[PDB]
Amino acid sequence: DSCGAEPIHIPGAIQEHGALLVLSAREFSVVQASDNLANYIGVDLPIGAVATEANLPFISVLSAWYSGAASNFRYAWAEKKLDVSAHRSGTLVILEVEKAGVGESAEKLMGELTSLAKYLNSAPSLEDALFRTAQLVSSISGHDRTLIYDFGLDWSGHVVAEAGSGALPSYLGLRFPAGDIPPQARQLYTINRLRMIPDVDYKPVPIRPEVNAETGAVLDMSFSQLRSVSPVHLEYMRNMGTAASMSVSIVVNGALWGLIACHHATPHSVSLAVREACDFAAQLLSMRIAMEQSSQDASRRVELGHIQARLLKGMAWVDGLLGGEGEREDLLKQVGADGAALVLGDDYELVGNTPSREQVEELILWLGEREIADVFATDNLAGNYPTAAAYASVASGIIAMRVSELHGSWLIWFRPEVIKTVRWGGDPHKRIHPRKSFEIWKEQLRNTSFPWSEPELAAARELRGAIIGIVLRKT
Amino acid sequence: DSCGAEPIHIPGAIQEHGALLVLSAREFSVVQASDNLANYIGVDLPIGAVATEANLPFISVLSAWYSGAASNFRYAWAEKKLDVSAHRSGTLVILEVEKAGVGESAEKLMGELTSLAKYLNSAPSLEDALFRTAQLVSSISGHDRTLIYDFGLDWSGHVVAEAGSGALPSYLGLRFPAGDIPPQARQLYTINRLRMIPDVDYKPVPIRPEVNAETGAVLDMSFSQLRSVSPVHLEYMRNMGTAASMSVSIVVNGALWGLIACHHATPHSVSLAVREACDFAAQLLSMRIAMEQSSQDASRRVELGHIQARLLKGMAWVDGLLGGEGEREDLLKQVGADGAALVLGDDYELVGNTPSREQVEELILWLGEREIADVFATDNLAGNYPTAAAYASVASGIIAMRVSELHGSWLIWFRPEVIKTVRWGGDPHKRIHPRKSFEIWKEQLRNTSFPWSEPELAAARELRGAIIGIVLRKT
Ligand SMILES: *CCC1=C(C)C(=O)N=C1Cc1[nH]c(Cc2[nH]c(CC3=NC(=O)C(C=C)=C3C)c(C)c2CCC(=O)O)c(CCC(=O)O)c1C
Ligand SMILES: *CCC1=C(C)C(=O)N=C1Cc1[nH]c(Cc2[nH]c(CC3=NC(=O)C(C=C)=C3C)c(C)c2CCC(=O)O)c(CCC(=O)O)c1C
Ligand SMILES: [Mg+2]
Ligand SMILES: [Mg+2]
C-alpha cells in the first residue's frame, strides 16, 4: 500500500474544536502549542514559560496526576467551560482542551450503558449484541448513522449492524475494500481506540514550534484527540457525503476486530464523557465477542473430538475410515466435508460427493509439484488451479495432506460451491484518490466454499499424525 | 443440611428501610402491602383498590414498563424523596420503595467504575483484579470491610481479597465452612445477585394479607430487595459483630463463583444506584474470571497436547513411555506428576519418585476390589486408603487407570505431599446456631497434594485410550 506510507501520526496540526499544549515533565514548562491556544485558555504562553496556578488553575491536580500511575488526565475547567485532558509522551505531557459537554447527566450515560451491559452478560446471539451496541452509541452520540464494521482476514470490512436517523444512506450488509482504512491507520486504531472529526472542512491549526526543543523532533500525536486527519480521508468523507464522523475501535485478543463508525450529514461534536462512554460500549461488545468466539471454538473442538476418537480406535486400518456407513460419515464430518479421496498409491477410494477419479488424479499431480509441507487448505481451488472450475460444484474448497511421499499417498476432503452475491459499497478495484460513488456494487462470487475453521484444520492435521505412523509401522 | 430446608424466599415480611406493594398486572389492583406502606407513600391503599395517578404519580411510567420487555422498573420519586423499583412475579408486579440516594453524582460512580473497567480489560493478574474490584466497592459503598469470597468445590469459601477502614477484623486468607451459606441461600444468590441488611436488629414489617388473593399463595419474595432475612444469619451477624452487611453475587459460566461481602460495625444503607453500581463491578470481575479460566485452561491443554503428541508417536511400545530420559520426562509431565508406575501383569516399571514396589502392589489390590470405571483420581489417597499415609510424602495424590482388566495392567501417576496451614475463620466442625468465635483457627493439612486439573484428567483419559487398543491390538 502506497497510501500506507503517509505518516498520519505527525501532521504537526490539530482540528478547530480544541487547542493543544505540550509541557516538559520536569519543569511543567511550555515547549509547543497550537496557534489557537490563546483563543481557548484566554492566556498567551510563550515557549520556555513555566505553567503556574495563575496560568492554569488545575496545575496542582495535573502535577499530582503525572506523579501517579494513571495513563490519562481528565479535568472539568468550570470557569472557561472547557474539558481538559492529557497523556504522557516520553518526558512530555501533551495537554488538550475542548468545549465542555453542553448539558448531559452522567446517569443519562450510566443509565443507557447499564441497559446494554445487563443485556449482553446473559450471553445472547452476536448479531443482536452488535445491533444493541450500535443502537446505544446511536442514542448517546446522536449521529445520523451508527454501524459496526467487522474486519475480514484480507482486512476488507463487512457492515454487520446499523442504526440511523434516515438522513444518511443505509450500508448494512455492504462490503468495503481494505484500502478504505490503510495499514498504518489500522495499526494506530489498535492502540488509540477513539477518533472524532466534527467538521470535514475544518482549517488545520498549526502547532509551533514545528520542532520540539526537549526531543529535537516533531510531536508524536498518536494519542492526540485533536490530531489533524489525512487529507485523503477528508476527501473520502466529502465523497461519502459525511460532514462529521466518529469511530471507536473494537479490540479483541489484542487485534483490531472492527469499528463502531458514526457519520453525520452536517457538522456534529461529542463530549469527552460521551466519547469515553462509546469507547466503553466498544469494550463491553469486545469482552463478549472474545467469549462467544472462545466458547464456539471450544464446542467445535469437543464435537470434532468425539468424531476423531471413533476414527482413531476404528483404524486400531483404512476400514476404520471406509469400513461402513458409520465410519465414512465420521470421515466427512471430521472437517465438515461433503466428500473425501483416500489415494494410497494407485488405489483410489471416493467417499460422499467427490470429483471424478481422473480429476482427483490430476489434482494430486498439481499438489505433488508444489511445496506442500503438512496440509494444503483453500475455499477457492479454482484461484490457483483454474482446471478445477470444471468440478467447482463438488470441490470448490479442499484440505489436501500427503500420508506417504514415498508411496504418493493423499487424504483430500472436498467442499461444494456455495454461491453468494457480495454487496460492495462502491467499485472495489477502481497520489491515489477515493472513489466518488458508493452505490451497492454486486458481484456473484463463484467457485468458493464455506471457509475452513481452525478446529477443522487442527482435526485434519491430527488425523494426518495418526495415519502417518500407522503407514510408517505397516511399511 | 437441615438449615438448608428453611424457606428464606417466603418470610412474608420485609426490613424497616423500605415498603412493599403487590399489584395485579391486569387492573394494577392492590393485592398485598407491608404494614409500613402508608408511612412511606403517605397514602393508605385498601386491598382491592386500583392504583391511579392520584395514588401513584409514576403509574403511567409503570404501566408502560410492564407492557415492555425490561426485567426491572426503576423510578426516582422526587416529591417523596423515594427510589421506586419493581419486578414481575407471574401475573403480579412486586413494587418496592426506599429513601432516595442522599447526595451522590452519577459521574461519582461512573468515574470510579471506569477506573476498574479500564484496569481489567488489559487482562492482568486475577489477585490484583480481585483487590481492585474489592477496593472500588469499599469506596462507593463506604463499608468498614469489603472482601471477595471465592467458593471451593465443597462450597467452603476462602477470602482472596479485602479492603477495610480498620473498624472490623481482617479475614483475608481465612477459610469459612459451607454451612455459613447453606444450599437454598447459595441457589437464591445465583439468580438474585444483590442483598442488603442495613441494620441487624431491624423489626420485621409484616406483609398483609398473608395469602395473595390472585394466586391463593404466600408471596414469592425471591427478587424482593426488602425481603426479611433468616433469623439464624442475623444471629450469625451479631456474633461476627456486624450491625450492617451488603453482598453481591459473582456468577461465572452460570454458577455462583463467589461473593463481594461488605460488612459495617454500625447500621449503614446503600442507594439503589450504588447497589446497582456494585452488582455491575461484580459482573466486570465475573467477565474477567471467565476469560482467564478459559485462557489458562486453553494454554494448559496446548502444553499437555505437545507432550501427548511425543508419547503417542513414541509408542508407535512401552519404550515410547519408558525408552530414555526424554520419554520418561514426558510421561510424568503429561499430568504434572513426580512419579508413575506402569504395571503390566507381574512386570513393574517405576519412573521418577514412587512408593516401593510392594506399596504400589498393595495399592493395585485395593483399586481392583473397588468399582474403578475408567480412571480413579484423588489429591488425598490416605482419606480412603489409610495404609497410604506411610508413603504420603511420595504419593499423597494419584491418577490410577487400568489398561487391561484381563492382565491386571495399570498406569498410576504419583504426586508428593504439599503441606500447608489452613487458616479457618473460627472452628469449622463445632435447631442449629452459629459459632460465637471467629478467631483464626489453624489446622496442618497433611497427606494432600496439588489438585488434579481437568486438562490433566483429560490428558490422562486420552493416553489410556491410546494404550488400550495397542494392548488390544498386541493381544
Ligand atoms: C490513501 C487512500 C484512501 C482511499 C482510496 C480510502 O478509501 N481511504 C483512504 C485512506 C484513509 N482512510 C482513513 C481512515 C478511516 N477510514 C474509515 C472508513 C469507513 N468509514 C465508514 O463509515 C465506512 C463504511 C460505512 C468505511 C469503509 C474510517 C471510519 C476512518 C477513521 C476516521 C473516521 O472515523 O471517519 C485514513 C486515516 C485518517 C487519519 O486518521 O488521519 C486514511 C489515510
Ligand atoms: C442455619 C445455620 C447457619 C450457620 C451455622 C451459619 O454460619 N450460617 C447459617 C445460615 C445462613 N447464612 C445465610 C447468608 C449469608 N452468609 C454469609 C456468610 C459470610 N459473610 C461474610 O462476610 C463471611 C466471611 C468473611 C461469611 C462466611 C453472607 C454474606 C450471607 C448473605 C447476607 C449477607 O450479605 O450478610 C443465610 C440466608 C440469609 C437470608 O438471605 O435470609 C442463612 C439461612
Ligand atoms: Mg472478522
Ligand atoms: Mg472457586
From TrEMBL, chains A, B:
GO terms for biological process: detection of visible light; osmosensory signaling via phosphorelay pathway; red, far-red light phototransduction; regulation of DNA-templated transcription. Residues 125-283 form the Phytochrome chromophore attachment site domain. It catalyses: ATP + protein L-histidine = ADP + protein N-phospho-L-histidine. GO terms for cellular component: plasma membrane. Its main location: membrane. The keyword Transferase applies. Its EC number is 2.7.13.3. It is found in: Cell membrane. Keywords: ATP-binding, Calcium, Cell membrane, Chromophore, Coiled coil, Kinase, Membrane, Metal-binding, Nucleotide-binding, Phosphoprotein, Photoreceptor protein, Receptor, Sensory transduction, Transcription, Transcription regulation, Transferase, Two-component regulatory system. Mg(2+) binds at D150, F151. It comes from the Bacteria. It is an enzyme of class 2 (transferase). The keyword Nucleus does not apply. Ca(2+) binds at D150, F151. One of its GO terms (molecular function) is phosphorelay response regulator activity. In the N-terminal section; belongs to the phytochrome family. This is histidine kinase. It comes from Agrobacterium fabrum (strain C58 / ATCC 33970).
